[PDB]
Design a binder for this molecule. Structure first.
Ligand SMILES: NC(=O)c1ccc[n+]([C@@H]2O[C@H](COP(=O)([O-])OP(=O)(O)OC[C@H]3O[C@@H](n4cnc5c(N)ncnc54)[C@H](OP(=O)(O)O)[C@@H]3O)[C@@H](O)[C@H]2O)c1
Ligand SMILES: NC(=O)c1ccc[n+]([C@@H]2O[C@H](COP(=O)([O-])OP(=O)(O)OC[C@H]3O[C@@H](n4cnc5c(N)ncnc54)[C@H](OP(=O)(O)O)[C@@H]3O)[C@@H](O)[C@H]2O)c1
Ligand SMILES: NC(=O)c1ccc[n+]([C@@H]2O[C@H](COP(=O)([O-])OP(=O)(O)OC[C@H]3O[C@@H](n4cnc5c(N)ncnc54)[C@H](OP(=O)(O)O)[C@@H]3O)[C@@H](O)[C@H]2O)c1
Ligand SMILES: NC(=O)c1ccc[n+]([C@@H]2O[C@H](COP(=O)([O-])OP(=O)(O)OC[C@H]3O[C@@H](n4cnc5c(N)ncnc54)[C@H](OP(=O)(O)O)[C@@H]3O)[C@@H](O)[C@H]2O)c1
Lengths: 257, 257, 252, 252
């Protein structure tokens, strides 16, 4: 197996929800840069394997980690798999880069939202990222990186996605408070807000929604996942060392009013 | 019983957590303005009665409603009591003004936050306000008002209150998304962000915290609850008809950097 | 009313939003200085309307954006306040006067830029500066901005720049003046019918109405009611703020 | 590097942050126009440093904030680009040049105000305007603002106003230029050691260091690395943004 070197050679990274979509693109980019990437998934193990194998065929290093998030024991399951894999491959449990990308999306009348729907959105999109950050701190060296994938919908009124917006609003608070907490350790903590992005899902196959999504960006297109990944990879690098506690707009001009 | 008239005469209002602190001040001000005020509480029934009686002795109309928020059946319990009281006193269940003020606060190391602590903060401060709004829409006439009491801590990094900050970040999203949803009904939906406010609690009796809280405002004082209530009462009035989807900074210059 | 015994200057009060603000502050009991550049008869009408409804008011001419402007304004203001009250004290300052323009960004000239900045940002700064010498503790400074500082509008970029500058006044002066308990805030109206012919053209009115989540352009009274609140003791704990009075124009 | 074949103008590149930006863009492969007002020898040093490390660069003199400034700048720039590349195409524009000042708000003069606005807001607007005629699709406009647009700083209110105006350029022009895929963004450095004597005074350096959550003032390279990212294809989906490169100065 040939080894491609890059700016993140020697670093380790966890990307949650890396089996497809934006997460996949993030893992691929971090892997290309030289980071040993833990490609996390809930149930898409074949997709996750494809990503990890892609990273390795291109000269990188990667492995998959299964953990359903939003249920009791989730963070323990995640970190058992992560730390086993990191120890096997590096001799240590150190985690340099954490990308909280896994999330769920939903569209529906606000009048129809149930308490169970609210709990699930909040459990996956806000609660799990908090507890993943909390657990990561015990193994993240000084100079680390935490990047939380939010949404432009925290700045664009979208009644049919209020629950989702609430969960991402909570997510964004992680960067604000933890950036200060972790300043002395030089761990940067930032939110990245993608605009509408073609994740290859069934919902993007629907003509009615797909038509309106393209016009949200000032560029008149939805994003390719790679356009979001390139921003995350920058934040994960030395070049973004003076950026912390920030909201980074990667929406292609969706937040212009 | 003598009747004092004001700008809100004929209107009805629910103020959650109106037994003490900011909520009490809000109820008193809305009552003085002529609104029939439902003074809500969880367990401080004697304090709630004192508030309602204060409102009535000053020429207004008020009654108390018990509901523990953040538990199954909470919104049903709340609205059973509210609607019974409104029907008894007005012949209708119409609710003109909704103030989501009830909330919990906590200070502690981020490393020590437990999942149970997170759930409770989110259940009371974000989830319950969402479901209260959802339920209120079925009884709120066009021209109504929804005011959510947030916190300046959504804009000031405060590691020992990250969980609280997350919950208020979620809360703030309610005004953004619902303002658009409800535009055609002319129901305004806004967030108000108090700065540190003397609520008469035990925590304000502690010298160490009380000293640092006073210096957060550019005025070098903590707020009196009445200073926050006067802002809420404005938002509840006709004079604030062109304000919706807004974050209203009632922090006495706490958010200046 | 709640401003009885207070004095106020409302710049650009001869018409539009400023006229509505003057009328509202006067009704609440403030002695209002009704400022104008060339609209002397319209200014006189506003002052008379305030008097007619039981208040006190007078007019003060000053063309803003030219050398000597703030001197002219404050000579007229302070003389008029001293004559009427026995003091030059100014409790409430509303920087409302402003100019608006639409055009392709490629056609903006340096002269157009200077004029916009001179009236919309520079004059408000020097008016605030001069007002500090005569504003008692518990005073109020309210700057009328625009929602266009938050909504990308290429045909109004120079106006946007000027209002972005104006908004910084509240940020920095709120901290400077905290110990005097003078609040300093920006109010951002949405599209508001100022009585100009522009707003009577159906196609233009329709387009502008759709900017608000309410599907209407504002009446000036809707903005004035917000300003009067900020000028009152009810807004004593609001300083350094951006107050969105746009009818939901800033929702994305 | 990732900017090979691209051309760039960095205003105020003779020293400080602009010098670091020029050096970084040149290392990435851009032909860099190193602009200055009076620092000709320092500008020459920067251009030589770029050449020495394998790149291409040249200097262009223009005093900004005076009549004819943009004409002088673009005559020099376009002639130099045409000579070196055969075209006047400008891919990357960095409005970095700016003036800073501290003093009591009561002592600010109209002349001080005009100078600050002329250099920090007006010249960037007219530079952008002129650049549109020679910027190809896929270009980049990056305006260097300041964290002080978000941190109340009474002794720097006029600077704050000027930077608040500057920030509006990205908002409005991002929408104007979307169909050309030219991104327009503001970068906000925190306190950054620009090599001036101010930063060698221990007491001042200590105070400024505490503004960042890292307890240090920035090296110019930390800011330049952010600008170089924005100038690259990696930032193609960032437009109309405020990018906080302040080391956690804006946390409250
Ligand atoms: N697409 C957009 O337009 C858009 C816009 C803005 C922001 N975002 C945000 O970007 C992130 C990625 O979005 P996307 O469109 O790439 O998502 P997507 O294609 O659905 O992919 C979701 C990823 O998250 C994982 N995941 C979902 N639920 C999980 C759970 N409960 N536990 C563990 N993993 C779970 C999935 O794993 P499996 O494969 O195992 O199911 C998958 O890898 C999300 O946070 C989303 O909110 C997306
Ligand atoms: N104090 C500050 O400095 C400050 C600053 C910014 C924002 N805020 C926000 O302002 C709001 C009021 O704060 P405060 O200081 O006035 O509060 P406080 O004095 O503790 O009063 C809390 C009120 O909420 C009620 N409540 C608490 N938990 C409840 C629950 N689970 N179910 C139903 N009611 C519950 C309490 O009812 P009982 O009397 O029955 O217990 C009480 O009426 C909160 O949303 C808080 O987050 C406060
Ligand atoms: N209308 C809107 O949709 C809208 C929306 C958002 C914000 N705004 C802001 O609200 C404020 C008032 O706008 P408006 O629509 O009411 O404007 P308007 O109807 O055009 O009235 C302009 C007022 O300002 C005065 N003025 C203009 N230039 C002046 C100068 N150089 N020196 C002294 N006074 C000058 C005018 O005095 P004369 O009568 O003597 O000419 C007049 O009283 C402005 O700052 C504007 O930017 C307006
Ligand atoms: N340093 C900080 O802490 C800091 C923090 C935040 C933002 N900023 C911003 O970052 C940018 C660069 O700041 P810096 O600290 O690197 O500044 P600096 O060390 O003072 O360098 C100023 C540069 O701008 C040029 N310049 C100044 N006035 C000019 C004019 N009227 N016409 C043409 N060029 C002019 C100078 O050219 P000459 O050499 O010919 O005089 C010089 O190259 C500025 O926009 C500043 O506002 C700085």
């Amino acid at each position: 197996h040939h080894h491609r070197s890059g700016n993140l050679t020697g670093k380790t990274a966890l990307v949650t929800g890396a089996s497809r979509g934006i997460g996949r693109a993030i893992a691929e980019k971090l892997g290309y840069a030289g980071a040993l990437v833990a490609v996390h998934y809930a149930t898409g193990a074949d997709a996750a394997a494809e990503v990890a194998e892609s990273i390795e065929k291109d000269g990188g290093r990667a492995f998959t980690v299964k953990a359903e998030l939003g249920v009791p024991g989730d963070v323990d399951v995640l970190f058992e798999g992560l730390e086993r894999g990191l120890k096997e491959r590096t001799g240590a449990t150190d985690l340099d880069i954490l990308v909280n990308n896994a999330g769920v999306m939903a569209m529906g009348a606000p009048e129809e939202v149930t308490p169970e729907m609210f709990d699930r959105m909040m459990a996956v999109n806000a609660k799990a990222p908090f507890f993943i950050v909390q657990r990561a701190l015990s193994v993240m060296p000084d100079g680390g990186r935490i990047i939380n994938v939010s949404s432009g919908l925290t700045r664009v009124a979208s009644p049919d996605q209020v629950t989702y917006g609430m969960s991402k609003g909570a997510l964004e608070q992680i960067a604000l408070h933890f950036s200060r907490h972790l300043g002395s350790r030089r761990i940067t903590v930032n939110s990245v807000a993608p605009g509408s992005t073609d994740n290859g899902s069934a919902l993007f196959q629907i003509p009615e929604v797909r038509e309106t999504l393209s016009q949200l960006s000032t560029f008149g297109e939805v994003a390719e996942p790679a356009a979001i990944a390139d921003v995350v990879a920058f934040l994960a690098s030395e070049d973004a060392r003076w950026i912390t506690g920030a909201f980074i707009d990667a929406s292609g001009g969706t937040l212009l009013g």
